[PDB]
Symmetry: C3
Subunit: 426 residues, 3 copies
């Protein structure tokens, strides 16, 4: 299942055996709520009724403007996360366009409405207060329960300038969301995947407050499309590889900057430089293509042979040999340099390995924690097999007198080109 290799030569590690679920597109749905325009038992409902009016009044000043959004991570492009959503929203403001929906959801709560600009959208009426108020109201406990949802949606939108994420159970109750997934124009694989991970789907969704007109409240829910499912993913962990000379400051370092999540995708490889745009559930990785780069499948060759002629593996250089650790999926990389105390420990047994200077690695099998300096790291105790791939630390292949000691957006070939240049001049 989940496995991991460590490369002693490049001070990196790859965790493989993951299955993609990349948000690729968006599905927009219009959620609605129909509204009403209007002793001791009475006075308490008069208070609960003004709560209603206040919520509505508050939702109205909220919509005096169209809703807002305006290592190698810096290489990414720039999106408009909710452009699709808002695009749908601006259409609901058109006259009659509201009345089509008010009409469509008359005998049912869940209908598909074709809109005037050709977007076919799944509409949903999740709360009919008009029906409740105009009849049942025109018991103090009954009303408070029905009204409470309305007020809470109002709180979320008011403190979020009218765009919320993750999408809450107020915006879309669990049962409403699951059923919304079912009636959705997608595959049986997406339907199951989404349904088995509704808490994730929520995190990847947007609730955009839209309009209050003609006794109707509308807000667009922006839901993820996972066009890429069950393709291989692997996570690349890198740590700094430095020399270990005695005199501190005479050392040269080197770090692979191409770390992140990597997934096979449509011939190429989707690269996620910020591995917090990805959420791992067991062996499934949920990613967002908005936060990715599209690289050749040859990018994977840097792992095994960082000197390969097919892809120019990206690194960075420095003379800053500080100690740290990276806690991988199935173990720990340790960069021990200078006078730092770095160890690995078991729970009850205590210290079971003292790391020598340079980049080393230990697997979580038998290890519970890792210490580098004053920093205690707990390792992930997830089940899986590690493979330590012994090799000569490539930092040893460079002569320190002609080693460029402050490159960030660099690569193996760019370093050799700067060495070849400085070598010539000598």
């Amino acid at each position: 299942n989940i496995t991991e290799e460590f490369y002693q030569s490049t001070c990196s590690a790859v965790s493989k055996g993951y299955l993609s679920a990349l948000r690729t597109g968006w599905y927009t749905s219009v959620i609605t709520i129909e509204l009403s325009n209007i002793d001791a038992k009475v006075k308490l409902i008069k208070q609960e009724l003004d709560k209603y009016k206040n919520a509505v009044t508050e939702l109205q000043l909220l919509m005096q403007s169209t809703p807002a959004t305006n290592f190698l991570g810096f290489l990414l492009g720039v999106g408009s996360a909710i452009a699709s959503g808002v695009a749908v929203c601006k259409v609901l403001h058109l006259e009659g366009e509201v009345n089509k929906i008010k009409s469509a959801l008359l005998s049912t709560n869940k209908a598909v409405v074709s809109l005037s600009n050709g977007v076919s959208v799944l509409t949903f009426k999740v709360l009919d207060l008009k029906n409740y108020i105009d009849k049942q109201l025109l018991t103090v406990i009954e009303f408070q329960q029905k009204n409470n949802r309305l007020l809470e949606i109002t709180r979320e939108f008011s403190v979020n300038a009218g765009v919320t994420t993750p999408v809450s159970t107020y915006m879309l109750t669990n049962s409403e969301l699951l059923s919304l997934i079912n009636d959705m124009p997608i595959t049986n694989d997406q339907k199951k995947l989404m349904s088995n991970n509704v808490q994730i789907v929520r995190q990847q969704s947007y609730s955009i407050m839209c309009i209050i007109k003609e006794e109707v409240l509308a807000y667009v829910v922006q839901l993820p499309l996972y066009g890429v499912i069950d393709t291989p993913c692997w996570k690349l962990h890198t740590s700094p590889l430095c020399t270990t000379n005695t005199k501190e400051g005479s050392n040269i370092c080197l770090t692979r900057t191409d770390r992140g999540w990597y997934c096979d995708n449509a011939g190429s490889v989707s690269f996620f430089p910020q591995a917090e745009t990805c959420k791992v559930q067991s062996n499934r990785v949920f990613c967002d293509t908005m936060n990715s780069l599209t690289l050749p499948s040859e990018v994977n060759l840097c792992n095994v042979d960082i000197f390969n002629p097919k892809y120019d593996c990206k690194i960075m250089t420095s003379k800053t040999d500080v100690s740290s650790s990276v806690i991988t999926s199935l173990g720990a990389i340790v960069s021990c340099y200078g006078k730092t105390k770095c160890t690995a420990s078991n729970k009850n047994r205590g210290i079971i390995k003292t790391f020598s200077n340079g980049c080393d690695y230990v697997s979580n099998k038998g290890v519970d924690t890792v210490s580098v300096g004053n920093t205690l790291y707990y390792v992930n105790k997830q089940e899986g097999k590690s493979l330590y791939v012994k090799g000569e630390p490539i930092i040893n292949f460079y002569d320190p007198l002609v080693f460029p000691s402050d490159e960030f957006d660099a690569s193996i070939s760019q370093v050799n080109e700067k060495i070849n240049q400085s070598l010539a001049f000598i």
Copy 2:
């Protein structure tokens, strides 16, 4: 209204036609809540009463210490976001200083109190529980409704170490906030602007828990002053401009780093390097001067002539010709390089343009989405006119043999100085 130019020569775009609203100062207000010190129907109120006591008790251990706060974005200074607020808070701890406020808000809920260090502050009593408990309490539903606000403010402060933002309707109800804006010593223009955008104002405000002494709870609300309104703003979007040679890795790139929000301000131009410190509502940009740089109005000359002699336009260089896109206000910039598939599409019609290698641009007029590699971007469908300004890609003016391929905090003149130096040596 909103318009946009694309510069084919510098691979950038400027969206103009926006109106400033920059937070420049802060207004502090002291919000108060007066407190009380003390079968089946009874037992439920005994539970609701201990909820009260627990909230108070919790608010008390919370205040055993003074409240806490201690591309070109890295160039910004560093503020103390709530220094003004806390400055006011430390004054309320002085003896008698509480009793002045308890006194002032005796016959009214909204009074201005001059404090001992010369700060004149608008005080506000938004909930008189003392009055309710000592009289009405010393019905089970009535008490729960009145008490509930107190508990919720207590939740917000307890999970936020006593400083909340955005400011909630619990901290300051909509009606309380609007009326607080009205009695505020500001212009008619600020009052209207603030009131039309209370959800934004909330996002730009702070609620700082302050003190519980002498039957009084106090917390300072820190509200934005918009000293700059209705001055021109424009947003600069940049993308990487690379050469497009066949052999991958023989290409040189170049990106304008001076991207962000730009606003006219008091002779100079306020620059916002992190365009997420700015919130756009329709055509109004709300910004924070805390997150800005003060640049000459001559900074705008980089757009039209990046080679102008009046301002040294800031760029960065690399050899990393990866493909991406930037979704502008009224369109999309596309940096297509190497073997990447980049297209633009309409909704129902499909693909309507295939981008060739190099930096190009397309407007949202007729386009719904843009694709660069495995990444689908939706364009903003906001209404407005785009202008494509044809020009020769300046990256072509540089000889690759003497082009500095890893500059970040650089400029046009710094690159020429490094070229002039390396040229001489040859």
Copy 3:
């Protein structure tokens, strides 16, 4: 108590007199909730009962997977913030392991349970709904109050993919938390420190939803261990030090990059490059060692003598002489360059100092605000003594013709090595 020195020579300032509280380890505790498996007065409880069932049902699809987590800040390592917690969680899934806890908390609510892998954990039953429902239920107001907590924990976990922080009073009520701290295997110093700062402890804790099996709900609370208390801490503030020549762009700059929080720790000094991983309460600094570097105590020598031979003080260079300010603990650093207007002001008196070009500093004593360009900074009005340490701005010691104008990850010796190299070639 709290004091501060400014170094005119290096354009930096150090605020000293703080007391450490560094999270070093984690304490895991298993919180439980025991569950039940099953006219006008009746119908409302039938609604409150399905709320129960819905919450439970929702908590169940939430746990179809193991919970998720997968200037000089870039030098830090990488942790697995909740690895310890999840490590404990995966154990509760083992058969019988639940039934041990269900058993242990039969006659009490707070017991220590040894688990099958040798971890001794403090278990806690904070809500016995099984007892309430199977007896009292098998009044409409009573049930709603008891049930409400359950629903709210369910909301927190559902919108957070099952991992929450800060830990709320729903997850662990104030009284439950304090008492959990008391029965904890730690010192009298940690117990008092933790208890006096429960709002902070909450911010530094994790609530990880774990399991629903055998009428039991379990979630692990991950609580901080403060192994380092009451050791000296100091905060280093740096600002750019540039020359002040007339012709703009002929100036060279220099900034100390080693800014952050610094604390004495076990022979070495814990360095916190991102001073927002640290929370200051009065004179106590709460830090996380996960976000730190372990440096020699000789790092403090850069303050007084940045040219000292014991530690290679870290700086960065540029030619970007933009004006800004840094608001220190007891004052303000001002970097005024070019045509910028920089001043310092009192509240009622107005402007009391106009800053000349170059890096200067003013103390909060008598000053309320500082202005640099269009940016108004309020200074922290915290009480304490400042010391201005006059010295020659070291940027004057460098010849601009051979000054490396774009170094980031550099140091005093690396700059001299690049100068010595370029000097030789001339």
